[PDB]
């Protein structure tokens, strides 16, 4: 209280955000403290539940509907003049049940990043990668290496030929109809597991192992968001950001996320938070500070977006974003991501078959909302 504590994921520009916090503290005298706890996405509703935590919380829009549903976030009330400074579709990203629950920051989408030196020409397809790997393995390199621990990175493939989260119908998602176990999704996950079985990829490659490999030039390509371009710029690797490879002739459909800023409902500093977000962060000068630390992607602020338009990397992010679809923000998104995280890993580690893994994934009661027991509640 009387100050501002912000939580932002560790892969974002928290130091750039901290710089905005000093500009604020210089004007208001209010100390802004930026933090980046591990697993904050799930640590937040754990603490905020007890009326504890940060005043402002950053994270992609998909989790906000759940927080909103449990009364963990304060309703946003920007003046119409301010609302017109951001792109309309980004406001809809953070609109839960008709009420605004967060401030949009930037549009994010996964892209295919490759080393122009080892791979002067990026694979047009997913199918030609195993052939490309063997070529490079011979030279002592790899063709592809990305974070397999988070289904956010593997989804583009699973969705390319047909997989989907929830069936959007009648202006509303259907939680009983999940499409993670359909033919298109199985086709996609199967392909990824074959890569693993054929020793093209490691089942346990995470974000850091992958990043290090690409940055040190030990692998030809990687799949990552805009925030990753900074470490690569410093690694001095000659890279390129381009469209994700297609699968079965169908483009990869990543789940587009809108970086959002939400105010803790139990926050005494609500009006302070509003001043910081609207008057200091969401400005050309504010966004820049952050961007310079670690690129946001395609910022929602119209004024600063026009400047970022001339960046070829941003253009590619936009192309990939166009082929995918914005993540739903329904309360069930957390259960879904977990169900899929489990299925992808079970399938990847051979603990389960793809058909078995995905099936159990679409039947998770935590996503469906119900369960039909074999017997019932009684006793004889
Ligand atoms: O792996 C499932 C998670 O995917 C997304 O998380 C993204 C986030 O949108 C993005 O801003 C950040 O840079 O990367 C993470 C993936 O590590 C969802 O938004 C999460 O809710 C899911 O748990």
| Domain ranges (residues) in the chain | 2-108+257-328, 109-256+330-380
221 close to 144: Cβ distance less than 8 angstroms: yes
The residue whose CA is least distant from atom 9 of ligand 1 is 60
Nearest-CA neighbor of 326 among 85, 149, 159? 159
Residues linked to residue 99 through DSSP beta bridges, in sequence order: 96
Nearest-CA neighbor of 140 among 116, 112, 118? 118
Nearest ligand 1 atom to alpha carbon 42: 23
Specify the residue for token string 């994270």.
59
Distance separating alpha carbons of residues 299 and 309, to the nearest angstrom: 10
Q: Would you state the structure tokens that stand for residue 219, as one six-digit string?
A: 């692998």
The residue whose CA is least distant from atom 8 of ligand 1 is 60
Ligand 1 centre to CA of 192 (Å) is 20
Ligand 1 neighbourhood includes 328 CB (under 6 angstroms)? no
DSSP string, 39-105: THHHHHHHHGGGT-S-SEEEEEGGGHHHHHHTT-BPPP---HHHHTTB-HHHHHHTEETTEE-SEEE
343 close to 180: Cβ distance less than 8 angstroms: yes
Nearest ligand 1 atom to alpha carbon 259: 11
Residues linked to residue 245 through DSSP beta bridges, in sequence order: none
Helix axes 333-348, 354-362, angle to 10 degrees: 170
Nearest ligand 1 atom to alpha carbon 41: 21
Given in angstroms, what resolution was this structure solved at? Answer: 2.9
Residue of 150, 210, 228, 255 best suited for mutating to test ligand 1, as the one with most atoms within 8 Å of CB: 150
The residue whose CA is least distant from atom 15 of ligand 1 is 152
User: By what technique were these coordinates determined?
Assistant: X-ray
Q: Residue 241: in which H helix or E strand, if any?
A: strand 239-242
Give Cβ neighbours of residue 270 (< 8 Å, ≥ 6 apart): 55, 74, 263
Q: Would you state the structure tokens that stand for residue 156, as one six-digit string?
A: 């583009």
74 close to 266: Cβ distance less than 8 angstroms: no
Distance separating alpha carbons of residues 21 and 288, to the nearest angstrom: 13
Ligand 1 centre to CA of 41 (Å) is 9
The residue whose CA is least distant from atom 2 of ligand 1 is 152
Query: Which DSSP state fits 114?
Result: E
**Helix, strand, or coil (residue 278):** helix
Residue of 257, 300, 328, 335 best suited for mutating to test ligand 1, as the one with most atoms within 8 Å of CB: 257
Ligand 1 neighbourhood includes 62 CB (under 6 angstroms)? yes
Backbone angles phi, psi at 292, to 5 degrees: -55, -30
Distance separating alpha carbons of residues 107 and 198, to the nearest angstrom: 35
Q: Residue 293: in which H helix or E strand, if any?
A: helix 284-293
Q: Is 378 exposed, middle or buried (0-12, 13-18, 19+ CB in 10 A)?
A: exposed
Strands 172-179 and 103-108: unpaired
Ligand 1 centre to CA of 309 (Å) is 24
Give Cβ neighbours of residue 17 (< 8 Å, ≥ 6 apart): 6, 8, 34, 281, 289, 290, 293
Same fold, 2-108+257-328 and 109-256+330-380: yes
Ligand 1 neighbourhood includes 191 CB (under 6 angstroms)? no
Distance separating alpha carbons of residues 258 and 190, to the nearest angstrom: 29
Ligand 1 neighbourhood includes 58 CB (under 6 angstroms)? no
Backbone angles phi, psi at 287, to 5 degrees: -65, -40
Q: Which residue spans within the chain are E strands per DSSP?
A: 4-7, 32-35, 56-60, 95-96, 99-100, 103-108, 111-115, 164-169, 172-179, 221-224, 239-242, 255-263, 298-299, 325-326
Q: What is the CATH number of domain 109-256+330-380?
A: 3.40.190.10
Q: What number of H helices and E strands is found in the chain?
A: 17, 14
Ligand 1 neighbourhood includes 179 CB (under 6 angstroms)? no
Nearest-CA neighbor of 357 among 163, 128, 110? 163
Distance separating alpha carbons of residues 48 and 80, to the nearest angstrom: 29
Q: Would you state the structure tokens that stand for residue 222, as one six-digit string?
A: 């990687």
Cross-sheet strand order for the sheet of 221-224:
221-224, 111-115, 239-242
367 close to 361: Cβ distance less than 8 angstroms: no
Ligand 1 neighbourhood includes 150 CB (under 6 angstroms)? yes
Distance separating alpha carbons of residues 94 and 73, to the nearest angstrom: 12
What contacts 24+ positions apart, CB below 8 Å, involve 336-343?
336/165, 336/166, 336/178, 336/180, 336/367, 337/151, 337/152, 338/364, 338/366, 339/180, 339/364, 339/366, 339/367, 340/151, 340/155, 340/158, 340/180, 341/149, 341/150, 341/151, 343/180, 343/189
Distance separating alpha carbons of residues 233 and 178, to the nearest angstrom: 40
CATH fold for the domain made of 2-108+257-328: D-Maltodextrin-Binding Protein; domain 2 (3.40.190)
Our CA angle for 186, 188, 189, nearest 5°, is 65
Give Cβ neighbours of residue 89 (< 8 Å, ≥ 6 apart): 326
Nearest-CA neighbor of 3 among 33, 27, 26? 33
Residues linked to residue 250 through DSSP beta bridges, in sequence order: 247
The residue whose CA is least distant from atom 4 of ligand 1 is 152
187 close to 161: Cβ distance less than 8 angstroms: yes
Ligand 1 centre to CA of 184 (Å) is 22
Distance separating alpha carbons of residues 17 and 34, to the nearest angstrom: 7
Q: Is the dihedral of CA 250, 251, 257, 258 positive or negative?
A: negative
15, 272, 375 from 259: Cα distances, Å: 16, 20, 45
Ligand 1 neighbourhood includes 35 CB (under 6 angstroms)? no
Computed on alpha carbons and rounded to an integer, the radius of gyration of the chain in Å comes to: 21
Ligand 1 centre to CA of 139 (Å) is 34
């Amino acid at each position: 209280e009387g100050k501002l504590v912000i939580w932002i994921n560790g892969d974002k520009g928290y130091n750039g955000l901290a710089e905005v916090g000093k500009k604020f503290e210089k004007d208001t005298g209010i100390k802004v403290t930026v933090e980046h706890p591990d697993k904050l996405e799930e640590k937040f509703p754990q603490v905020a539940a007890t009326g504890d935590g940060p005043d402002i919380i950053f994270w992609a829009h998909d989790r906000f509907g759940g927080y909103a549903q449990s009364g963990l976030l304060a309703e946003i009330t920007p003046d119409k003049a301010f609302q017109d400074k951001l792109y309309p579709f980004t406001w809809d990203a953070v609109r839960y049940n008709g009420k605004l629950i967060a401030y949009p920051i930037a549009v994010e989408a996964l892209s295919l990043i490759y080393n122009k030196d080892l791979l002067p020409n990026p694979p047009k397809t997913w199918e030609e990668i195993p052939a490309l790997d063997k070529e490079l393995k011979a030279k002592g390199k790899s063709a592809l290496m990305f974070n397999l621990q988070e289904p956010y990175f593997t989804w583009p493939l699973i969705a390319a030929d047909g997989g989907y989260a929830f069936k959007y119908e009648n202006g509303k998602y259907d939680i009983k109809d999940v499409g993670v176990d359909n033919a298109g999704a199985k086709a996609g996950l199967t392909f990824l597991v074959d890569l693993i079985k054929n020793k093209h990829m490691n089942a346990d490659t995470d974000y850091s192992i992958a990043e290090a490999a690409f940055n040190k030039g030990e692998t030809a390509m990687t799949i990552n968001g805009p925030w990753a371009w900074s470490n690569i710029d410093t690694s001095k690797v000659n890279y390129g950001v381009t469209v994700l490879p297609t699968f079965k002739g169908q483009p990869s459909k990543p789940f587009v996320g809108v970086l959002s800023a939400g105010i803790n409902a139990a926050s005494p500093n609500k009006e302070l938070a509003k001043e910081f977000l609207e008057n200091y962060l969401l400005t050309d000068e504010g966004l820049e500070a952050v961007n310079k630390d670690k690129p946001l992607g395609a910022v929602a602020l119209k004024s600063y977006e026009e400047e970022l338009a001339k960046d070829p990397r941003i253009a590619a992010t936009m192309e990939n974003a166009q082929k995918g679809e914005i993540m739903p923000n329904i309360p069930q998104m957390s259960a879904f991501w977990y169900a899929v995280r489990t299925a992808v890993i079970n399938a990847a580690s051979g603990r389960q078959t793809v058909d078995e893994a995905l099936k159990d994934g679409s039947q998770d009661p935590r996503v469906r909302g119900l369960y039909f027991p074999a017997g019932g509640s009684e006793c004889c």
